[PDB]
Design a protein around this motif. Sequence first.
Motif: not given
Length: 330
Positions: A21-22, A24-33, A95-104, A121-127
């Motif tokens: 999951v990307q 912020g700007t520039p993107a910070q990529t974290l691996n979420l559950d 952003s997830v897989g090319g889909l971007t939400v602003t103000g998340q 291995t888990i940097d957080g959760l995406l509910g």
Amino acid sequence: STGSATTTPIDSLDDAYITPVQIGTPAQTLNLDFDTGSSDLWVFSSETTASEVDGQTIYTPSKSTTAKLLSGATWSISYGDGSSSSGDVYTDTVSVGGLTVTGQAVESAKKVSSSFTEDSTIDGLLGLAFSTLNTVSPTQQKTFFDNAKASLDSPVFTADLGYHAPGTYNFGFIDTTAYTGSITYTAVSTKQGFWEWTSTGYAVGSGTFKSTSIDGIADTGTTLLYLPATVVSAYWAQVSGAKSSSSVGGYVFPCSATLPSFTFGVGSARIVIPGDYIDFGPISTGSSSCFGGIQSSAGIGINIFGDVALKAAFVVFNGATTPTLGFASK
């Protein structure tokens, strides 16, 4: 719009899956559950108590030009496995897989419980449950899916989890090449904030199908399949030497066993979980006692169609005005 991201098991047993999951700007990529059983997007961060970080990638909001503190907002969550986390809240671009939400709403952990620390291995959760479960106070926040929904080509996301292999989360479209046969849709109750539905029954191995209503939740954030004690006993009775162990914490079975399949009903359709999907390996390193992937829900208060069940299917989370769930074989 649409998005498509690969989800990858964290270990050789499929204990959980992580999806990049990307933020912020520039993107910070974290691996979420990605967790269809909860509704907070929270991350390890530069604010997380240092002794509670052990190998995870952190989000640093101060390095994101689009991050904004959500003033006065806090969050605190406890999960069914007894784990927990809490902190404060930023809004930022996600952003997830090319889909971007602003103000998340990106919930930044100040504290996490030991099981989170211990899993590097888990940097957080995406509910991905319903936003009514979101824990942000005093102003409840929306999930990533809820924020994206209006922009999506179709108001859906799909889970296609792999057995001992990567899989896919798609947003906004149904990949008709990803499943066999047809998708059977079934009613959802959102009353408890979950993707809650009623299975039409089960079979063990090559046994006859038992028609019986089993209410439960489609929960990508739970590893195992938790069902009523009657059902679970019927399954393990077909495995020589299997027993429920209070000391271990569930049904265990001899690692030398060949496990039978388990079938669950979706309307008139049937999803078959192969026996190997139900093997979670030794209870401790070197043991010949193996932990079962079907366990009793007694005392949870709800049945849970976790990864063991969901990975046997292509699953549609249909967020139309009246939500529904779809299941196909694959």
